[PDB]
Amino acid sequence: KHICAICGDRSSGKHYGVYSCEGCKGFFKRTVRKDLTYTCRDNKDCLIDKRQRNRCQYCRYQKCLAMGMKREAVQEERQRGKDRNENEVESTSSANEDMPVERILEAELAPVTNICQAADKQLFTLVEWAKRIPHFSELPLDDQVILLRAGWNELLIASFSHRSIAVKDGILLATGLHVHRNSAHSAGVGAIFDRVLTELVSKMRDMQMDKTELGCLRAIVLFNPDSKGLSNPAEVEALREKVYASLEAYCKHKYPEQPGRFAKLLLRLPALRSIGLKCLEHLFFFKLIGDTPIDTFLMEML
Template identity: 30%
Template structure:
């Protein structure tokens, strides 16, 4: 059968086409480019899509005669929505090809960035797959106390210095528009042609907006606010107290940990995952959602945000918070993972469900433990993961003010503990954990995406909503 085929779908006015799509970007680091592709991630039974022969894994290259290769997800959605009751899709390859490519991306993570020749799809080692509609990226840059632009990882500035475009954008809260297709070439020679694409490239290589100095600190390079703006009747002491209390109230008691399922030796741990492993994986993820939501509601100022902003912040940061809180609770030197419901499992019990992602989480846990992060510092760090700017916020200014207050609390606490030996640069190291979390989040998304394609266990609705960013038609 030819790898290319045309699928025509017809539906009645009161029914849907019956399929879902996902758009992903393939980041080629050597070319500083992102290759977009959209494919079918689910076909519902008894629908026009199934009757027409559409398959999960089919890549969509055209819609109603229009070439959509490289077009963004939401634009493709609008084209499909405007199709009426008849839809013509140009598709490429099939499930086996897409699975092979996915395996290559997963192998890329396992090998620490080196994809071997035996992965089956010939994907270069400088390529990375990431979901285009999610806030998580593969972070390659972290620093604090230094302007992000001074060590430009996008290589847009010359070594002798120059003006700092990302700083200007964040400080002025500037909003740009691309007059082309949002894929303009950006390099040293052409960096001034499109401000929108330049800023997107800064974010794509892992630069972190949270460590950019604010507008009020121009000329004081690399220093965080000494006196961040505070909401009325709000003091740093009461804020950090609320953060610590929220953290303590949301962790399982050390005297009530559940070891009933704990096993240090697990037979056949190298076999392929089965439905039991995947269900355990989903249960551990979704079981954390309510705990993290209740924790967030106890953050001073969070409950006063619009409900839509609360939901957006929570869903955008959930996976990072799951990783951070699990890493802080667990005992990596013993291979023990302590989940939010108090269940304790050995690493070997999680490998088949979590895959190689669990080892990355344990490595992060070890680095966190080596820093000897105290509870107040960790409470502030966790709050900064969720209280940050996200696209689509109704009141971003209120979120920014709360973020500045938390940064001020963390800065004051670290400064007060600065006299302790062995703690130089603690603030910088703590903030440096934020891009590490985003990298781990990308690996987690890879794992969830892989399990969804395997389709041994239907993912819970919350997983679809938060992680997959799919829309039914």
């Protein structure tokens, strides 16, 4: 009838938007369904013709994209059980506490060159804290490192920015120093420091952030499924949804007068990340710049 716009072979009609041969139609499908990633061994120039089209997949799929084949034109496996849930109830009545809030709570109860002293000293603490947070230890010892590497930064900040409740216009490093505001501007890090006071310390402060609620948030910042490397992201993404659940309920119990508290608690997260990124910025600027005043645990962390 027609000619396949991808390889030249005879096209058996239309498939996903273009005139494709039955072969190419199957290639596109499998690629999209099993979500595969191909790489070219030449210069992304490999020629596609009925003879040598299996010569290189990357090039072939791109020939597809270009000739107009649409990915969303593909439906998914008309043969799934699509239910990772166990019959009836997986923890009778949800248990709500598959991620017990008490455990976290307990786990929580367990100028510049001065800051980093706290950091290092505090970085050995994190393994302790995380170690105590349920389901973390049952995770692959690799993902544990990935999880803690990608989040030590944020976890550490959200810890002291709470510890600095009261103590206005200043903050207490984990060891004992009361680094006060004006004491930073001199060092040149007055911009960042102030942001911590105004969108963390402050906000956190006027909210009466329950020492629990904090730990519940640090858990969410820990169980970050997006971290690159997790041999399995689905599991991590889950343990976070569990914690969304626990904390979510924990406000229905403790703060019934505040329906929109759960959300207000989760919105402390965006700022915790900008501030967190801007800080790394001020570390890869104090390290490669040979000022090297840090210790040892800050070497693999960077």
